[model samples]
Target chain A: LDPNAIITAGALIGGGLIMGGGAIGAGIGDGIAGNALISGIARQPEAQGRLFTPFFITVGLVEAAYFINLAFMALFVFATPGLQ
Target chain B: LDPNAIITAGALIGGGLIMGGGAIGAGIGDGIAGNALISGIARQPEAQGRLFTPFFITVGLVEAAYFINLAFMALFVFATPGLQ
Candidate 1:
């Protein structure tokens, strides 16, 4: 295989790992918050108002971080980003 | 194998590490804040409005910190930032 091909393939695999990692981490985080939010609301029905928005904000932030990871993964996989 | 291939592979691995690290850290941090936000809101419904903005700001800042880490990872991997 050509030297460039080696680097390109590495980038491809690396991109996959990055994407996968982001999904797992973000999902885990969102799940944690979701659990806490639901339990809190169940215990105190009236406080659902405050709980919902903050939980939503947490979900958004967690997902935003994952999207950022996705962007870089795309840059590596599709663009000629590995070339010097 | 070419020496360039070795270094390129290392950078590829480094990129994956950086991406995964950022995701995990961001998720865990966000989850911690999320749990607190929900619990606090549940306990004190009246203060939820006051709490929402601050939680939002905190989540954004946490994600921003991850993005900064990601930017440097890209710089090191793609821009020959480590050539020196």
Candidate 2:
């Protein structure tokens, strides 16, 4: 195998790991948050509006963090030509 | 392997990563969101309509993001000639 091929392969694998790991972490987090939302709403049906907005907001924020990880992966794949 | 072959391998691997990672993440997210929906409905049976709509909307949004990632993988597999 050529040297460049190896480096590019490594980049691909590294990027893959980053995306995969982020997915797992985000999934776990969403699960926890969703659980909390369920319990909170269960306890206070009348306060559903207030409860849901915050939960939604927080989940969006978590997604934003995931986006950041994706951005890093993009950089790894495209920015580092040496790896290719 | 030739340079193109190496690049193709990288693309295939990267595409797999994108799809597999995305599926895992989406699965976890749906699970959490579904749990919340169930509990919310159980607690306030009368509020089923209100609860179900928002839950579905959020779930759809999450699925949309997952689909986008899938599309990227499809591109890697089909659009990129070397990857074929």
Candidate 2 CAPRI level: acceptable
Q: How much is B59 displaced in model 2, in angstroms?
A: 1.5
Per-residue alpha-carbon lDDT of candidate 2 for residues B1-84, written as tens digits (9 for 90 to 100): 587677667778877887787788789878888888888778788766666645665566566557766776776556643221
Error at B40, model 2, angstroms: 2.7
Docking quality level of the chain pair in candidate 1: medium
What are the per-residue Cα lDDT tens digits for candidate 1 across A1-84?
A: 577887787788778778887888788888889888889979987777656777887787788878888888878877746564
Write model 2 residue lDDT over A1-84, tens digit each, in one string.
667666666666667667766666566566667667665766666787788778778778877777777898776666645743
- DockQ (C-alpha based) per candidate is 0.61, 0.43
Score candidate 2 by DockQ: 0.43
Model 1: per-residue lDDT, tens digit, B57-79?
88778778788778867775876
| Candidate 1 TM-score over all chains jointly | 0.83
Model 2 segments beyond 4 Å from truth?
Answer: B79-84
lDDT of 2 at A21: 66
- List clashing residue pairs in candidate 1: none
